[PDB]
Design a protein around this ligand. Sequence first.
Ligand SMILES: O=C(NCc1ccc(S(=O)(=O)C2CCN(C3CCOCC3)CC2)cc1)n1cc2ccncc2c1
Ligand SMILES: O=C(NCc1ccc(S(=O)(=O)C2CCN(C3CCOCC3)CC2)cc1)n1cc2ccncc2c1
Lengths: 471, 469
Amino acid sequence: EFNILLATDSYKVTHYKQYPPNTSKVYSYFECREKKYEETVFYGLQYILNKYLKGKVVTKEKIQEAKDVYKEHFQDDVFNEKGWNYILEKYDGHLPIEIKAVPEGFVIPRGNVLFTVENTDPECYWLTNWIETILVQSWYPITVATNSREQKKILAKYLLETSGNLDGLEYKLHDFGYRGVSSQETAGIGASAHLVNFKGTDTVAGLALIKKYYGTKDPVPGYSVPAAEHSTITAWGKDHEKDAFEHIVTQFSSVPVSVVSDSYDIYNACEKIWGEDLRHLIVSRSTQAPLIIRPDSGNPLDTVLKVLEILGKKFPVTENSKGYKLLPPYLRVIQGDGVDINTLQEIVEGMKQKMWSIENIAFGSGGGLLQKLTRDLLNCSFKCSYVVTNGLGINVFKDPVADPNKRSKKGRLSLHRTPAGNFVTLEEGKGDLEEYGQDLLHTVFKNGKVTKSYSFDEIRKNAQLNIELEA
Amino acid sequence: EFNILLATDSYKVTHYKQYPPNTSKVYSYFECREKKYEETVFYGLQYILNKYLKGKVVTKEKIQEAKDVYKEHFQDDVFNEKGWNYILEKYDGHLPIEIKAVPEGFVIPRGNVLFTVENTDPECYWLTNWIETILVQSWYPITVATNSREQKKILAKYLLETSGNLDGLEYKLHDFGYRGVSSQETAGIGASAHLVNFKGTDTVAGLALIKKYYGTKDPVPGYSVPAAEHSTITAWGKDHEKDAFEHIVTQFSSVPVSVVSDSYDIYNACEKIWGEDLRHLIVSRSTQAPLIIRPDSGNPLDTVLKVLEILGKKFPVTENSKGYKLLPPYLRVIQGDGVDINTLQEIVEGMKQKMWSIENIAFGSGGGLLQKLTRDLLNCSFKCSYVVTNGLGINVFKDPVADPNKRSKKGRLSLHRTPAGNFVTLEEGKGDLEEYGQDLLHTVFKNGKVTKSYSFDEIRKNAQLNIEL
Ligand SMILES: O=C(NCc1ccc(S(=O)(=O)C2CCN(C3CCOCC3)CC2)cc1)n1cc2ccncc2c1
Ligand SMILES: O=C(NCc1ccc(S(=O)(=O)C2CCN(C3CCOCC3)CC2)cc1)n1cc2ccncc2c1
């Protein structure tokens, strides 16, 4: 059983005693602070609201559990039992909090308010920042979605340049990250964030999350194809790599199949096994059922180029309408080793320089896609900007002398369209002057209820690339 | 609920069709592959075994659910319903798998077998590697525990050099990482791994995991103290920082209290507010209840040194028996911004050069401790090393031409003590020759039951530093 009273940084347990006496309101906001990721995809808050924040989250038992834990953890009695009992008694354990947020899937420049949080009962001034820790974890799906979308931009540029269209773009970056993330929960969240931009995943945990919390018109949001791993090749024995390849492509003769080909010698596998011994089994396959050769070691760019050169000499290559080389439709490659946003760029650029179409390749990314990311990448941060004490509203902020990048926003915030159609965040309650039209934030949570939500299909639409929008 | 049939990489669903015909056994192993970080702390498997692998993990409903999902996911019917049905009917949904592992807390050099996995029923040859994905996630608590321990070694060396002892070492690196990790589950796992080495955490989720899966003689494995955040200072208004500080230290007058002091001007706060206006509230505090000043911005080394320099001129500093400067016992500092293993080393070395004892300082680390880590750091990896096909055992491995670092081990494996007291992994079933004493791997899981468990106290004992011993 999850217990929201035990789901905060320890020190926050002591904060109710630290605010100015007679504080009735604490108002805080989240942004990806400006400091190259100029825009972020807002995604993942809906998961958190539904799984952790909504409904009766306080019970008599949960209060007692927290009291008992904090008594030992602090070696002292500092826990606000009275405050949590008030919520239990007055609101039947529902949080007296209002959260306003930008729509999920929205692409917003850095340094804008993405969501705000405030207490709706003056007794619960302390509650706004109690939940900072859980809400700040939204950094992760935001950052995965954003970084995934940035790779989609690279892929789109090079696919458009080398082929003249964006066909298959949404299958060009496949999630390999299930084993390489830190937990089952993280796998579901991160995989779901990648699926904002793409349709290919092996991280099955993502499907159930999307189905439960977001929803799609389609049966599933993401897809895969049969494929080998090293164990299904090496199990045949070192001298029988060819027998393994033959068995596998024959088992999957009518659907696409990927076969990892570097167990012993990738160049030999491509040139002699696929290119000669088993060539008859490849050239006979359907366009809907290609063999996808998967190298998995060595320098990613050099290995990709070498594999393409080998296959290009063993199989009939054509030249597409843009003048780039194209493998026959029954044969493709996937590079799924050492892929992150930097190496992805290096590979597609290297392919372009060697006149190979990006149509030839897909990418699998694991740790690079889902794990090698931190809160510091987009500077996702939650800060108090407004309080009411003794009935007087005060605009509050931090502004550290040695780091202007850490300066926080002041006062009540709102998000607006500028006359040129861009976003701007108004501070100090200035949105009230109505010089910039309506606040674009929507109330998504109020007093224990989720009040606005988005389907996964709408989130995908919101997160589209401009170039996809053109077409 | 959680469904083990849906907790694997998609492609593994199709592997049962790909192994050699007449394969009755697939045996696989996990190591932190060799390519600093020369030794790893083995920790976290017990959590995975209990939460996900033990007991009745297959039901009719879970089989049907998986069948439905994979039909849409692959746009094809490739799922091994018959295989999962067999486990359900024959073993009441318990996994016919045996796992042998080195004891948790053990500190083992890179490139050694840490655990092995094999099927116990020939029909379930495909199951060994089905659960690779979930078992490989053990990389995370292993890596957190290892990286946390490496920081403990740095702290230990500098604390010993500058103070002559290791008093308080176990409170010198505090977990600040709750908000900076990717999920609630990750928070609990990562925090528990840090607690293998230290006793200070704000990541409360770690305590419940330890209580549920491991257990301690003490009521809790980790502790904290009251402390401010920027919001509890800034809420008073920019002109009232002093009022905020006064209120907070007075509220927590007889326990340790940490106060973030960089909301507007850290140097002013130390020199004028703490150092003059409120000095009388600081010098009256108990040794058991110090003020801990917390800078939180700027170059971490430069800021730590400047803060110490300021405090050193406003408060009575002593020189310890090693010749290093020491703040009075009612006053300490914690640096909790931008701390990772590299910057930690930079700070303590910089302090030593400026003749400041490491006694003066503690470190808080968040993303650096629990999030800025990947499976590539220790090359945690799971590979098949032995199969039985047509009744014959075959030693198998990968050995990619362009990367010798990715070569895997061959055959049945065992872990042993060398004559010199080090570790060695024997390959090709050579452990059976009994020339290297007893196998250090113990059966921890067999046919759906956890067969050997460790308390958190035992794990801590196993993971102790030599210098502590
Ligand atoms: O091979 C793996 N998974 C299956 C897979 C293979 C290839 C593609 S793809 O991206 O090449 C994909 C092919 C199918 N085509 C189309 C061909 C025409 O028909 C429609 C699909 C789209 C493009 C997508 C999925 N894995 C999962 C891993 C996890 C961790 N480590 C290693 C792993 C290896
Ligand atoms: O202040 C915070 N937590 C409380 C805390 C403060 C100081 C220490 S400490 O490590 O300085 C600790 C002091 C008490 N001493 C005792 C030594 C023996 O004598 C009594 C004091 C040990 C050494 C430990 C815990 N946080 C949590 C955060 C999470 C995310 N971002 C920022 C955060 C700020």
